[PDB]
Design a protein around this ligand. Structure first.
Ligand SMILES: OCc1ccc(-n2cnc3ccccc32)cc1
Ligand SMILES: *Cc1c(COP(=O)(O)O)cnc(C)c1O
Ligand SMILES: *Cc1c(COP(=O)(O)O)cnc(C)c1O
Ligand SMILES: [Ca+2]
Ligand SMILES: [Ca+2]
Ligand SMILES: [Ca+2]
Ligand SMILES: [Mg+2]
Lengths: 323, 322
């Protein structure tokens, strides 16, 4: 039916369990006092590499083949330089294979330094997609590597879904999961998992209003990507949903809540100050969603809500700015 | 025998457990690698009010009596707008009584607004130690209230001991606790508890080398307070150890590790960046201790080490400053 099944999520958990953390679920009376609801925080900011994306990246490294004639990937390649590229590098390192990040000439020096500091090699391209594509395909082919998309690669989607296996086991009375959405790999993996195991549990997406393609797609009933690169402090959810995650999200996600830039910032600061968790602003999106006016339309029966705190890869300098 | 015994810690546990968090113990692969040890981090930064101090504060509010007919305090009065005052204020809220903070009339608006944010009621005094003390005495008496010393009050030392009761359950094979020390209420409480329950477990203190009265006292065999108020980023451990906590520390604490300012700062940033826990610098003291050269020489048999991350009440502005 979909590009992944619950069986794929379980194969992923089996494949990755020995190398990731089964992150804790923490609580806050203050947030519980504030939102009306009984909240649980799945702490993927404590995951290896600083975000959940090690789950999908490691599953892809351990499950994908480079070719019909070779079972073992000999390198990994991606155009993503943030959390995904960091996770993919670490996964490659675990498996003893090189990682290549395709980067435009125009990337900030800080981006180039950070990639080299996570242990990946940089391959330069022009800021164009013709270039980026020529370059990554050349690298993938010449290194006998796997290209690992940050959110549309089914092995990636299947790995991110393992968050929901943990949450359901950790929070048996959970009524809903709230998940920040960019490309929708985490959303879709979690929606597959929840709806396979316990479809009475709601799956809700949280998204910046400034980058609201998942909301607009669900509103319209078809895939409507951002027409232009979005501007948001939630830097990890600037991708649009794609052709592999959209059908899952259309059919299996119960609702989308959009949140303003100010809502994201206030929710981020609230978590920093009142929970003492250094979430990245992208991980504040799900918290802003549950605090938002529109989340008041959620039935009072939906009491036990687990919010995925998806990452903690924040720079203090980038902070000082917007705080 | 000391100003408390383990019996007092058990009482404090029953008194407070319904109202505080049984904070988690977390771990860090990178910090295990940097130390060579199996570290466990007791996350008192997640405790109600942002530090462990609610344990001693609540125990005191629920067990001390005012100088009045009614045996229950009708208010709490404090000089502190820090972790102690915040803890006492929350304890007062739980008990449905006002908390008053005595503030010099020349306090900045910023501080006053901040004080009122956590819900304390300001009473003004004149900016001298005489007026501060006399206003607090007056307020305490007129309100039928109580005052609670931040580290030498027996009820406070006993409540802080409850940290160790939880750690010994949460980490059954623990070999050592590392505790930041200022006035030593937390250290003394923990030492009483550990030495009562599993005395083969080591109790180590950690303090800034800029405020090294605990180290000096243990070396000399006698209480040697800081000659002058110390300068340290570790704001929460500027107090010297006192007459009530010293004998406990003298007898029941295995060793003291001192750390420089730079070590404190580096350890704090390491925890922020690698553990994603917003600890205050005072809580970075114990982490710095375990990372320090002196600690590296501790016997390898002391493998499982629980560090108390004592607080997370840090101001963003001050952090930007360093
Ligand atoms: O409120 C205290 C407070 C201090 C520091 C931060 N912070 C923001 N981005 C960061 C990156 C690394 C370390 C700390 C960081 C947040 C909050
Ligand atoms: C990548 C990322 C997301 C978004 O996941 P998608 O699968 O792209 O929807 C959310 N939070 C953080 C911290 C991320 O790094
Ligand atoms: C009060 C405090 C300490 C020190 O406790 P003492 O009992 O005074 O030694 C340590 N860390 C934090 C965060 C504190 O607030
Ligand atoms: Ca979007
Ligand atoms: Ca005495
Ligand atoms: Ca000292
Ligand atoms: Mg498809």
């Amino acid at each position: 039916q979909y590009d992944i099944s619950f069986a794929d999520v379980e194969k992923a958990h089996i494949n990755i369990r020995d190398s990731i953390h089964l992150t804790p679920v923490l609580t806050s009376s203050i947030l519980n006092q504030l939102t009306g609801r009984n909240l649980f925080f799945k702490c993927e900011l404590f995951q290896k590499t600083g975000s959940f994306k090690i789950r999908g990246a490691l599953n892809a490294v351990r499950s994908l083949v480079p070719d019909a004639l070779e079972r073992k990937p000999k390198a990994v390649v991606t155009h993503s330089s943030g959390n995904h590229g960091q996770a993919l590098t670490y996964a490659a390192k675990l498996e003893g294979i090189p990682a290549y990040i395709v980067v435009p000439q125009t990337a900030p020096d800080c981006k180039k330094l950070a990639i080299q500091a996570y242990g990946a090699s940089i391959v330069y391209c022009e800021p164009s997609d013709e270039s980026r594509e020529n370059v990554a395909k050349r690298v993938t082919e010449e290194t006998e590597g796997i290209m690992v998309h940050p959110n549309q690669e089914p092995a990636v989607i299947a790995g991110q879904g393992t968050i929901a296996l943990e949450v359901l086991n950790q929070v048996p009375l959970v009524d809903a999961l709230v998940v920040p959405v960019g490309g929708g790999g985490m959303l879709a993996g979690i929606a597959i998992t929840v709806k396979a195991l316990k479809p009475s549990v709601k799956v809700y997406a949280a998204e910046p209003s400034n980058a609201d393609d998942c909301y607009q797609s669900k509103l319209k009933g078809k895939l409507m990507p951002n027409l232009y690169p979005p501007e948001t402090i939630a830097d990890g959810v600037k991708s649009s949903i794609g052709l592999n995650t959209w059908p899952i999200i259309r059919d299996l996600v119960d609702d989308i809540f959009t949140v303003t830039e100010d809502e994201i910032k206030c929710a981020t600061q609230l978590v920093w100050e009142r929970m003492k968790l250094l979430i990245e602003p992208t991980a504040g999106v799900g918290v802003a969603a549950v605090l938002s006016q529109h989340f008041q339309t959620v039935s009072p029966e939906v009491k036990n809500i687990c919010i995925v705190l998806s990452g903690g890869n924040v720079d203090l300098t980038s902070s000082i700015t917007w705080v």
